[PDB]
């Protein structure tokens, strides 16, 4: 819960971010960014979202005891975006 980076990104015209997430409570694995595809919002935002980053918060929500499907639903919950941006707190 230290050396954390706050990442802010707006989605594309199709409402996608360009990253993959693996893990969650049900899989007994931490939530990890498995891919960051080129030229996408997760690739072009500064600070950049990187592969291997562990997701800690999504729009301020603690994901520790949440299932993989709940994490994905949190990412897609556009109404929870502060000023239309998805906020992530990650551990590189």
């Amino acid at each position: 819960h230290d050396n954390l980076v706050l990442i802010r990104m707006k989605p594309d015209e199709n409402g996608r971010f360009g990253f993959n997430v693996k893990g969650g409570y049900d899989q007994k694995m931490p939530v990890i960014v498995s891919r960051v595809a080129p030229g996408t919002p997760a690739d072009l935002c500064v600070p950049r979202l990187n592969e291997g980053d562990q997701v800690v918060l999504i729009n301020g929500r603690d994901i520790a005891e949440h299932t993989h499907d709940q994490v994905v639903l949190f990412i897609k919950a556009s109404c929870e975006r502060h000023s239309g941006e998805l906020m992530l707190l990650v551990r590189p």
């Binding site: 360009g18 990253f19 993959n20 993989h68 994905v72």
Partner: peptide
């Protein structure tokens, strides 16, 4: 399992 967002 990994999901595309």
């Amino acid at each position: 399992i990994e999901s595309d967002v």
